[PDB]
Amino acid sequence: LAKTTQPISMDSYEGQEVNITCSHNNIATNDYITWYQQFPSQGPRFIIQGYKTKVTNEVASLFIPADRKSSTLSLPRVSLSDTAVYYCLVGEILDNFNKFYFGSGTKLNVKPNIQNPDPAVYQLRDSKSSDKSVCLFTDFDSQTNVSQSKDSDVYITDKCVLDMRSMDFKSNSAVAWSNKSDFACANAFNNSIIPEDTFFPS
Amino acid sequence: APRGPHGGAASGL
Amino acid sequence: IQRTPKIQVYSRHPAENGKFLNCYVSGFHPSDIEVDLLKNGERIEKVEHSDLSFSKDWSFYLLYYTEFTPTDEYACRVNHVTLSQPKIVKWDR
Amino acid sequence: VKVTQSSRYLVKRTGEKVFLECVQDMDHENMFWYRQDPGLGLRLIYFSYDVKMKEKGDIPEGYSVSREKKERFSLILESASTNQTSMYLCASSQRQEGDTQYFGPGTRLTVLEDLKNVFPPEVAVFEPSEAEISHTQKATLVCLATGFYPDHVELSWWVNGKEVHSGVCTDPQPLKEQPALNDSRYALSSRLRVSATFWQNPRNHFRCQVQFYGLSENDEWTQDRAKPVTQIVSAEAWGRAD
Amino acid sequence: GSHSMRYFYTSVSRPGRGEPRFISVGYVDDTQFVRFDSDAASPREEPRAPWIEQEGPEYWDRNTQIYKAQAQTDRESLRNLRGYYNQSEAGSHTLQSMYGCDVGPDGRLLRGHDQYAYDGKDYIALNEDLRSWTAADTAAQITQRKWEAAREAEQRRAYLEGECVEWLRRYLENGKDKLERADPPKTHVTHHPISDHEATLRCWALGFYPAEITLTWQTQDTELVETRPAGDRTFQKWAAVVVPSGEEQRYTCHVQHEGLPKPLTLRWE
């Protein structure tokens, strides 16, 4: 069973320090504290380890209070690529003895700082002739929550951060679509809470 | 308690 | 690489008629060693002993002990590799 | 720091004996097999602290392993079951630092009762809104990968025959086309955003590529449909003045 | 006062008769509290003092698996050592290890120890700075460079400053009444005619804890026995001097021990 407890997830904006506190009340005297970082579609990677004394490297710093009952991973000002699962592990391992267990970790979602939001909902038509039609909700600020559709025949993706590196421009979007002919972008994102100023062209 | 791997238990001469 | 056991034989508490006879082997190396405690020249059978340890000097030591009630001779038969024949030591002061 | 695994995507029928390989070239004494499942993190199946040595982890049931050489740690699903569908991650570490573990790239394995619901994606590219073009001076193409099963796809964008990563975002996870079904096929979307002037040039070519990992040879097929093998499915558009 | 935890390891090879025997004992001050013996019918760490029996199953199990791994590490060391000294594959050999921590009443680390003997002789030992090693001979110099390269000392010092300190804290807290006791030595002087000319004067010290004591006859003619344990958690010792008759008066036995207020001055009554 898990001897470490930590938040299932947390959100952060790019450019802000991120602190992740892990609880491990039953830590044994011989246990070390080790953290891993798992990028999407990759295996976890070791990033920092300590016992009592504060540790700092290029990736993180690790704070351990007096009783070692908890510990804090401190990420310097995060960038979007820091989106990852952070695992806190407490234990000891040697030969057949293995008290070193991962757990579920903290999913860190790093959100872009949208400079000038221009929320809008645009209709895109298939390159070939009509099988589906697609609506695009884009350029909204990162706090926007996109809900799934109430309709069985309508699909709505989650938001997604797009980075146009050459322009220094980042934007959010979500996609909605359906093959029902009574599908119109005006009401596609109805089950979501969108800005009053959202641009809906004709 | 005796020292484990972090303290030298797996470090041979 | 070879050291001969220093043997002591003695009483835990003062030798008063009525109700732990000890034999302390130390300073020896290698750690293989045979220790019998003897009553009237015969092996006492139920004899405990300490866990092998050693001092800062790296010299091994062991404590062999049974229970005493005095009156009958008592000895300590010890054999080590540095002893041509077993070494018997008599008991009291 | 070179830990490798032989398979990246596998589809298997229930009952099959399935072999997963893990190799490291670091002369590490410890090797580990974990599975990672949504919400449960990584759970240890088996580890090995030296050649020939095996130690059951927390969830060994239904698995075997092989450590006949120090370099390699094989995982075997003796008789595959659907609940063994997972992401399998190998790791290794030195005896002296067993908690400093180096991970392989992982193997996505999907075990099914039958291969009849296996489908490659349909792929379609949607051209930028003229409204988006005049309002933002940018142009977002959308790719939809739809109706595929299992969830084993890798989408990429290609502009004028070269893969791009700038201005791209793909859903980190797919949707179920039928959320009320356990059997549901999946859909996935991606955007490629460019300047409106670039899209407006008819010599520019955009292609959305979906690598599907499906059946292999040695997977028997009976049905009407083309066999749903590992394959690439692409859709494209050319820029337009419009 | 100032306290100590120490572990004493002995690994003994026995080629043909199987693997080396690995044995460990642990002390807090002069009190043994655990043992392990790889030859035991069911090898596990076992309690050897009342106050350590408090520890739960997890304590015993982890310590047990650590000894087993240490035994394996020692087996490799003994192989390496046999090479270093160009020794016959057939001879039995002994590797002794002692490590541990000294603290003051402050409860802070006062001194660290981490040392080795091979076949009775000093091999290698961690210096008091806990950052450097003293190799005893040319063979131990190989080990020295090895650990220099690997920065072993830092691992050693880490345990010594952290875990060892902490664990010693816990044991002194639980064995409270029985670890920071002080039993003063009961003393007396015996006389024993060797000849018509002379006799032995023997100075006794009994029943004291801890073992640390000084004992002199006021040296070239002084016999001094090794301090010896009673089987209680206590120690004995004596000192002899061969002395002419009608002459016992110019002799003085001096006794020093922490459990007593008066550093004793004894004459034969």
CSV table of N, CA and C in Angstrom, one decimal, chain B residues 1-12:
chain,number,residue,atom,x,y,z
B,1,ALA,N,19.7,0.6,14.3
B,1,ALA,CA,19.4,-0.3,13.1
B,1,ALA,C,20.7,-0.3,12.2
B,2,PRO,N,21.0,-1.5,11.5
B,2,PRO,CA,22.2,-1.5,10.7
B,2,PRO,C,22.0,-0.6,9.4
B,3,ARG,N,23.1,-0.2,8.8
B,3,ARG,CA,23.0,0.6,7.6
B,3,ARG,C,22.6,-0.2,6.4
B,4,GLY,N,21.7,0.5,5.6
B,4,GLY,CA,21.3,-0.1,4.4
B,4,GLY,C,22.1,0.4,3.2
B,5,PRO,N,21.6,0.3,2.0
B,5,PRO,CA,22.4,0.6,0.7
B,5,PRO,C,22.8,2.1,0.7
B,6,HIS,N,22.0,3.0,1.3
B,6,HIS,CA,22.4,4.4,1.3
B,6,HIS,C,23.5,4.7,2.3
B,7,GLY,N,23.9,3.7,3.1
B,7,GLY,CA,24.9,3.9,4.1
B,7,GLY,C,26.1,3.1,3.9
B,8,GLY,N,26.1,2.3,2.9
B,8,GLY,CA,27.3,1.5,2.6
B,8,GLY,C,27.1,0.0,2.5
B,9,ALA,N,25.9,-0.5,2.7
B,9,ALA,CA,25.7,-2.0,2.8
B,9,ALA,C,25.9,-2.7,1.5
B,10,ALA,N,26.0,-2.0,0.4
B,10,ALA,CA,26.2,-2.7,-0.9
B,10,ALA,C,27.6,-2.3,-1.5
B,11,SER,N,28.4,-1.7,-0.6
B,11,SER,CA,29.7,-1.2,-1.1
B,11,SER,C,30.8,-2.1,-0.6
B,12,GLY,N,31.3,-2.9,-1.5
B,12,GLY,CA,32.4,-3.9,-1.1
B,12,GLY,C,33.8,-3.4,-1.2
